[PDB]
Amino acid sequence: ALPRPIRNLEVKFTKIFINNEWHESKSGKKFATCNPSTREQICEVEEGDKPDVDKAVEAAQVAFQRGSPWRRLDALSRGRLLHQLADLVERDRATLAALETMDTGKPFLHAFFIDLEGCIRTLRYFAGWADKIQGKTIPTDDNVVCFTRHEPIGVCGAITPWNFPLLMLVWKLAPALCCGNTMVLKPAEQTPLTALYLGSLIKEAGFPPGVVNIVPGFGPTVGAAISSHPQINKIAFTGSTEVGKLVKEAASRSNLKRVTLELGGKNPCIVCADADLDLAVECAHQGVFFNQGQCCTAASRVFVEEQVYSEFVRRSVEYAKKRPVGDPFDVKTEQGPQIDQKQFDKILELIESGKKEGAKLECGGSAMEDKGLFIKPTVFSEVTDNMRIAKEEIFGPVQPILKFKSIEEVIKRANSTDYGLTAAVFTKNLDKALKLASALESGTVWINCYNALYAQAPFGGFKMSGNGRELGEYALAEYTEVKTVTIKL
Amino acid sequence: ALPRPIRNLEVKFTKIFINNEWHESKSGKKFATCNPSTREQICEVEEGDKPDVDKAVEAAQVAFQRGSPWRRLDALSRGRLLHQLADLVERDRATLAALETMDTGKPFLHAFFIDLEGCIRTLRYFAGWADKIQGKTIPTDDNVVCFTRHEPIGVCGAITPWNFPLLMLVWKLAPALCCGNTMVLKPAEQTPLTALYLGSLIKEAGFPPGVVNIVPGFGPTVGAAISSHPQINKIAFTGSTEVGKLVKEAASRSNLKRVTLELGGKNPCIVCADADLDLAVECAHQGVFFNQGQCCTAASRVFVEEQVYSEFVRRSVEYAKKRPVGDPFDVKTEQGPQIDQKQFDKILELIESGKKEGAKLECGGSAMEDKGLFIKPTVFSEVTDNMRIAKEEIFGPVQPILKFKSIEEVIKRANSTDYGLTAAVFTKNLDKALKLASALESGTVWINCYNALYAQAPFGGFKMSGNGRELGEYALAEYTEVKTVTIKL
Ligand SMILES: NC(=O)c1ccc[n+]([C@@H]2O[C@H](COP(=O)([O-])OP(=O)(O)OC[C@H]3O[C@@H](n4cnc5c(N)ncnc54)[C@H](O)[C@@H]3O)[C@@H](O)[C@H]2O)c1
Ligand SMILES: NC(=O)c1ccc[n+]([C@@H]2O[C@H](COP(=O)([O-])OP(=O)(O)OC[C@H]3O[C@@H](n4cnc5c(N)ncnc54)[C@H](O)[C@@H]3O)[C@@H](O)[C@H]2O)c1
Ligand SMILES: N#Cc1cccc(-c2ccc3nc(-c4ccccc4)cn3c2)c1
Ligand SMILES: N#Cc1cccc(-c2ccc3nc(-c4ccccc4)cn3c2)c1
Ligand code: NA
Ligand code: NA
Ligand code: NA
Ligand code: NA
């Protein structure tokens, strides 16, 4: 029974969450969050700045202070708390999906069956990890006792983008909390509503005050305050590569806080001659056009082996025709509006760039109408490495298709980039599959699928696509400090 | 039969090591390395710069390229190569100890029975780890196969100081090499001889050319070229906290290369009333005066509980007077000269600061004589938190001793710092020992000992004393990138 849309439900939580209490800005300033579809203003949210960040950091330090209720808890009890938060999230699943779609213009069905699903699963997983975070006892000498503890790093700041506001937020809160940290979170300016509702849910679930604080605001104000705050021990950022460099160098400059970075990527897609062409084309269509093409794992490059190149292109064009584009709450829609104007502007500008460099076009190339921010699915052909459509992270609906002959060739080409978030390989041949998986400088390598994210499997970027990892057991390493204890007898 | 010092053996390796070949600096410039005890010039070493590092990085990139001899090697074969390097290190152990002591003025016995010992043990340990670097296979769905590979991160630059030139170099080379990386190393300007001799040994053992390249030179020229090189994937730095911040932020600005930082620390020493006062005094004396007090783990603050404060002070002073200080090659000496002229100057300057800020003095407080750069072992008393000898890393022979009453008190006081490298606790009480071990924000916590370093146990700093860890299995995490491979069926 697919739920029907929550038509016009009002917002309730719009203030700064600190010590389980709602506060007004120190300055009193407030900003507005708008609807990417209605093109009209949704509501107003408190606009925090450096003083509010100072207050939240103090709260988080007090909740983390030795002997605090949060510190004294059982590992199993922290896990139980995370499970409680997951239960609450599930109870209010439709409300959260509705807020998410209002804030991002994402299809309500997408928000219900993707964002919230991943949120719940991530919460459950890291809840399971809470009482299973184990260090080592080390052999050294007959008279010595040597072991390691994995302790919480302390206060952790989180900074998240607009494409998946809540999900990217859960990815950090879950592991950080199961390791017993305290947090200061900052949602994007565009989409702060889900984060504040989750703060209400955190309070309801019984987390001690000060363990999670939420301060909405703008990147250069609240973000900069967190990234260079002297009392924050860890920072986790997901966003653009440039702001990621800014954050990491601010952390280096301030207090040497540890940094996790989930950034962008020129994600390649590799189709081999022996592929299941139907599934390959379908998955490439998805990886290029899902969520309006605005996700960290967008396929920007598509290498096809000559033996099927033309056939692939043909089928690709075909598949692009039957793609729903309309109301986000529409049950038969797969693509909503864009986020703001700059992304739409530069997407059309680089479509125009590509058509002027010698690439055959077969689909779309314009905007449907001037009611929202919709673009027609575009499909390019006869693309080269030297073209901008093959070297710049697109972040939109466009499928540039290149041609290759050798395995070694496609390896060299795909790896020529500075990014390395994801890569996808489609082939039925065991040897080619495994050789490519081994050779691709990519943090995730999907084979005969796409967007296969799992709470149990680590996600992250090689090279300039990130530093640490989220999801999986690996996320735990970013939220713990190792201490050695050596005792002579 | 302990060997006597190799009296007057000439230096042989003084050039830039690249592709197993010795090169003169592109510029032709050279700098001079001197003997801190004889005060006379040891030798001249090639002074490399950005061009030299570019050449070395190109060598390392080609040696790491897919299909190279280094890549095609077996895990067990990499381990055997490391073991060969260890054998060679042991064969030439006396030459190397002589080089290190000539360069640093370290007691030759200390270099032979500590530095080279730790080097060989570290090499053996990480050689053992080579074929045991294993990822995971992850449960997900009935039709899915998910696993992770731990791959070499790529080209690794290493920057290491003068206090333990060869050891701090091995601490990086061993784990980096057992994981199948390639390296560009830069020893400190003061002490590059052991590194170049080690390069000769590296060639002899059979490492393919380009796997390890060494460019001596100064921090701002070669060091900066390394830290911000766009073709360096990882950086490992050991030195001062400020230069560490500089290095991490240059890495942030250049290409987001991963960073390991072993920095300084206000290493506390905590003596409880129920300690073995004799052992407490002996280990604190050693931890504050060993290697002339110029090591990362030097005890700069010594908290004593009132019940034993005065007696401790007495025994400490007495123990400090009877400490040999003379020729490093003299078999009955425990303290050689200082590092260079600036460090001796500032050590005496802060001795004067301490005596002029209100601390009772009982040992030294001036320079012994002017035959080398020697200082008499100094011991201060009745020092408080706010005094300069208790808040600035001493890095010399000086034992500031404070007084405490409570366990909670000493915990809060010790943790008030921004550093967190090491701490030492001396007590016979199980509960106090373990409670302190848990509460101290310290990367290493010795109990009833000091300077107990083990290749099997990770070493590193909390807070502003570092980022990653060296030694142990944990070091491996710093030299590998995690890749997820997900296959649908
Ligand atoms: N590089 C350019 O010249 C250029 C061109 C077009 C658009 N843009 C803008 O870049 C942004 C990309 O959007 P995005 O959300 O995917 O990535 P982002 O870089 O804007 O970061 C997303 C999250 O990080 C926060 N943040 C932004 N700057 C920060 C900073 N200096 N310090 C700390 N936190 C900061 C943001 O508040 C948000 O929560 C858009 O706002 C876009 O308008 C930039
Ligand atoms: N500016 C001052 O006020 C001042 C005064 C006296 C001494 N110093 C310096 O402090 C240092 C004492 O601490 P230390 O020598 O044990 O550790 P360190 O901080 O000097 O670092 C040791 C290693 O890092 C290298 N390095 C230095 N600067 C670098 C940079 N910008 N980029 C990359 N690599 C760099 C060095 O060549 C060396 O190999 C000395 O180097 C001394 O010259 C500074
Ligand atoms: N955490 C999380 C998260 C967030 C978003 C999406 C996903 C996600 C992505 C892909 C996916 N395929 C399956 C599946 C189910 C049955 C058979 C075969 C495959 C589940 N899947 C979940 C997970
Ligand atoms: N890796 C390494 C490394 C580097 C420098 C020094 C040391 C180091 C430091 C202290 C130490 N005590 C023992 C020992 C031996 C026998 C019985 C009890 C203790 C060995 N020890 C090695 C290790
Ligand atoms: Na908005
Ligand atoms: Na390996
Ligand atoms: Na007690
Ligand atoms: Na702690």
Numbering used by the authors:
A (entry chain A), B (entry chain B): 19 to 507
Paste lines from the article.
As detailed in the experimental procedures, we co-crystallized ALDH1A3 and NR6 and solved the complex structure at a final resolution of 2.9 Å. Our crystallographic data revealed that, in all monomers, NR6 binds to the enzyme at the entrance of the catalytic tunnel, and no direct interactions between the catalytic cysteine and the ligand are present. The NR6 heterocyclic cores lie in a conserved hydrophobic pocket located at the entrance of the catalytic tunnel. Indeed, the cyanide group blocks the inhibitor in a rigid and conserved pose in both the monomers. As clearly shown in Figure 3C, the Y472 strongly binds and coordinates the pyridinic ring of NR6 with an edge-to-face π-π stacking interaction. All these interactions are further stabilized by a hydrogen bond that is established between the -OH group of the Y472 and the N1 of NR6 (3.7 Å). Actually, the presence of the cyanide group promotes the distinct orientation of NR6 respect to Y472, thus stabilizing the binding with the protein and determining high selectivity towards ALDH1A3.
In particular, the ALDH1A subfamily is composed by three different isoforms (ALDH1A1, ALDH1A2 and ALDH1A3) which are involved in the conversion of retinal, an important mediator of vision, to the retinoic acid, a potent tissue differentiation factor for cellular development. Previous clinical studies highlighted the high expression of ALDH1A3 in cancer stem cells (CSCs) correlated to a higher risk of cancer relapses, chemoresistance and a poor clinical outcome.
